[PDB]
Write a protein that binds this DNA or RNA. Sequence first.
DNA 1: CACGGTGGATCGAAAA
DNA 2: TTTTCGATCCACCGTG
DNA 3: CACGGTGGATCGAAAA
DNA 4: TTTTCGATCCACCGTG
Lengths: 460, 460
Amino acid sequence: STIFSPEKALGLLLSLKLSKWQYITLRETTIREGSKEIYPSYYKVQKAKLQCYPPKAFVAVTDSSAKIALQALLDLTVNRIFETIRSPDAIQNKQLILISKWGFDGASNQSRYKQGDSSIFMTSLVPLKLTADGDTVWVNPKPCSPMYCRPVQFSFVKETKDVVINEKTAMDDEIEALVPSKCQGHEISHKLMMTMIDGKICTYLSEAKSNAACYLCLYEFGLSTLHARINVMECLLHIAYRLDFKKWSARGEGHQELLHSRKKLIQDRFKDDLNLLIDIVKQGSGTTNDGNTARRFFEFPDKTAAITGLDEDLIRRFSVILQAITSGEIIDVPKFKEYARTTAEKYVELYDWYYMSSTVHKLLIHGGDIIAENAIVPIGSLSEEASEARNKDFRRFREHHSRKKSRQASNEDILNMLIISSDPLISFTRPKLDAHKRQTYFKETVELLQLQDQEAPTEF
Amino acid sequence: STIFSPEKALGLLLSLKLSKWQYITLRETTIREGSKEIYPSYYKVQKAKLQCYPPKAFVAVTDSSAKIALQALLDLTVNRIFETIRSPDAIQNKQLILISKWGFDGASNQSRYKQGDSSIFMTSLVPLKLTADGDTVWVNPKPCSPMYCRPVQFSFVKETKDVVINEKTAMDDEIEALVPSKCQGHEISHKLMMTMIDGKICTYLSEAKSNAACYLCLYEFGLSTLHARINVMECLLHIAYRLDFKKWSARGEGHQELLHSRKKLIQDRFKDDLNLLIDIVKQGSGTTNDGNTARRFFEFPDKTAAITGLDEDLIRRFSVILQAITSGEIIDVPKFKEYARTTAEKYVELYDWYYMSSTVHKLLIHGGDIIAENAIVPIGSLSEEASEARNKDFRRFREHHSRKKSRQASNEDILNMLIISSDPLISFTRPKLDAHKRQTYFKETVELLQLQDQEAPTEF
DNA sequence: CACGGTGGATCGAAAA
DNA sequence: TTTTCGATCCACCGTG
DNA sequence: CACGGTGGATCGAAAA
DNA sequence: TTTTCGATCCACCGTG
């Protein structure tokens, strides 16, 4: 007999982001004005939380890192998504399977020059849909939202590709290491897709291309593995590297100095223009600073194409063809094919000195027919907004919410609040934003795309 | 017909420190669970706030600074303290006067090395009691609390003594510039005391002593003007400066180098010990870093007296006699007098080389009889906890609450939330602390003081 | 180094 | 017996 | 520069 | 007529 359910009061704690102290104070002030039934006491919130945890048999918590058993975590999640909204026993007869996207990335812990918090990265899983015979019973209303990035693991390690392959291999041991979920008198098998990637990890792990050659030219998407964004921007800035002589080679001692000084002044002017972070940053002598900035190369098409002096029209065409696929809309096979033909005419004509990179040519002659029979899927990688807000809350949880003790339970409580944000039982009432904020992109997309869609994604 | 009064809902916004967004979200979630009458909508909170403001005829708001008319502010405050708890028309007949303490100080805006927010300082007023014939009708339950530091002015200027005297003079023009308050069919005159001082401003403004001489030795409290703390610690560290030769003079080129290096190593070891901020800090070649640290010289009596190697017993005696006055307890005239005699015996004996400073000797021969007929009052300067939490909220209000616009209304909103924290109508439910936290100080106080007190101040 | 802030462990009592 | 619930207490961490 | 966050101005409608 | 109330919109400011 309480107004707020404890199961709703936990989501109330979520939306407000309160302390324990804040919550007890608010309840008690509601009390002292004669009204009792509104706020449940904190103890029932505690019980709701312990319910939302998986049992501590599977928690691996350290000062440095933490993880969970994928099996038990999936079972917990399907138990919840049972209980919350599935109209119970709408069907029992046909055998059920649960579909999920998964993956991970990280970021550096930017801080003052007087700080051990260096970087973080988080193994992650998101349930997308629950399938039965009559239909997929369950769907996520806002899949790309961070509301369902159930954490699987995280660690306090810099994003060095070695430990990246180590966690890669580990999770690849665990993919088959599941037994189907058994709960609620029901068996439900599982199925995963590894797509929740930042945009550099397939260049880390599938580097076997290395711009070597093009197989058809003489399957591998590139659009579904980092979206091939970084390669195109990297090769066009390599052109911007070679924008003085407009020649393939500069090797022998003829251009190195003025090349270096020209890129220095490009890096300067870009620091003036967009707060583009330093590109001579170490990174092992290779510049890849930001993939979101890589995208921001293409929302200023005319602007940065003037800054680089390349034909704004051509890179505008390519920005169009790039933003035309990941949106996942129906693309006309022959029209986009022959537009790739015309843009290739101009690409190969107006630039002869340098060579085409891997994924560009893979698109040029080869990409269209690949789009014909492709398994193109809007990659389940959480939105850039999602990942950014995730880092935001992570910083804050560690800073304004975490326990201050021997600090192992610190990261425990972090995982706790994360999985609470994950448990689909709580309908997490996110901070308000404009309803759609989905800017229908350039007219060159508007006519090169088709508006007959069983989707309308804002970002994914 | 709402559970929370808007006048209480504003204090509810205070205790929780919420956004507008947070408040509307919490109310609406209370709505969607069938219960309406609990939370008043934000509009009535708006009205409560505009009521709590003084009319904008008197607001002086800038990008840089802001102030109010003392007259109108006092009238607003007495109007509130009328309405809130005065049992109305308990008396009308006898003419009423209102007593208030006032003053100001500031602090630097400590920030990263990548920041215009440099320092702040705030003219301030606090109403203590309202007087009538039968009794002082109104008292403050927790006077030294920051709950009633009604802001009068503040500015974005470094604490340079020039503008300090300028604001000093300004407020001294305004003291007499009041007409008695007229509201509620009642006249009530006013009366102020300038005591809300940091601890350096009377050394700024009443520097006419300059350790020159002692008048009685051949009125001016020193205990009621900065409590004479900084002078005693400064002269004893000057002794610590001269703790190698233990002689008055070192002037000619004989000691300057090793003096400098010795104070360097003292500053080093103190940086290791307490996080004592740098003392060679510019300040115009004069070291006065922190008055709270000046106090913290005396809560480690044996510790820092060992670090300086001075007799821990003597400075322990002086710490006792200092903490024995501002607590305001009844002090036995002859016993404390003759204890000042004995501590003077040992002070003047064990140290002959240097000379006594002003306020020390003023205490020694002279201070006791001055305590006899003194106007000793526990100085109305807000607690160090109060001022610290004030800087804390100021930083946060500017950072997590302020409007982000042309930023004049920024400091407007700052003043707004401050005066809301001030309006005595709202019984501000502060963050919880231990009930008393009043450590009954050293036994040398316990017997040199008397326990027959119509006061028991935790800090003031 | 002392002093505010921290979700969850424990007390312990009362309840229940 | 369980179950609530307020009190505390942690051990660390900023700015002092 | 683009993108989340901000108390108070205005709309505007409905109410009232 | 007034009075509420949700929507928006500000123009700036961090980390990107």
